Amino acid sequence: PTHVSKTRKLRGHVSAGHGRIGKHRKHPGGRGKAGGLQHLRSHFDKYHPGYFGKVGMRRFHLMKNPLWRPTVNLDRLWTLLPNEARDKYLGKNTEVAPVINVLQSGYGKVLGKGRLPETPVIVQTRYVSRRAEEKIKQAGGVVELIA
């Protein structure tokens, strides 16, 4: 609100907490990001390096949708399934192997961080890492590419 703020405690104090020797002036140091190479260089160099100059090549008319590729790791593949499917298939030897379509989960690539249980599993995806596939095949499952 307003009643638990300052300017309710500086009522009576001259200068309102901005000092006498220097005062509260409008823009004594410049407006906005003015500086950065002339008199704000100390703050800019020590707290925002890399701010000035160009790095890299431009891309004209960039569109994010063709680049859309969220990634999921192996340690979340079984959580992508419903609880009933995990109960039916995790740790149980069956002729029919559970399938996870990570694309319907919102993922464009399956990454290999984490461990995967020993039960066989079918992973349907667009992209996959090299050792992500190695662990899936190690766990007895297969990776099928989706497009």
């Binding site: 667009r126 992209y127 590419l145 989706i146 497009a147």
Partner: protein
């Protein structure tokens, strides 16, 4: 590649259909009446001065000079080449 995101025939394979030909795509096809009318108008009107200049250059066999002049007159080299082939057809037919 079919059904593999990357490759040459990338993408999902879902049978195939033969789309009907849209009448708008027929635009650009030369019609019988249009060909007849344009022949009449060409006889009635003739050629522009730059068309005449190009035809003389083609007659004197400065093909590169005629091509460069037509590009200068029309703006693009594609339209220049089309005009050269149009005007050399006129030359061949008149010799016939």
């Amino acid at each position: 590649a079919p059904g593999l995101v990357v490759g040459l025939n990338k993408g999902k394979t879902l049978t195939k259909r033969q789309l009907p030909e849209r009448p708008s795509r027929r635009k650009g096809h030369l019609s019988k009446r249009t060909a007849f009318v344009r022949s009449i108008v060409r006889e009635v009107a003739g050629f522009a001065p730059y068309e005449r200049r190009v035809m003389e250059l083609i007659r004197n066999s400065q093909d590169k000079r005629a091509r460069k002049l037509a590009k200068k007159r029309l703006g693009t080299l594609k339209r220049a080449k089309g005009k050269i082939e149009e005007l050399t057809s006129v030359i061949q037919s008149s010799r016939l």
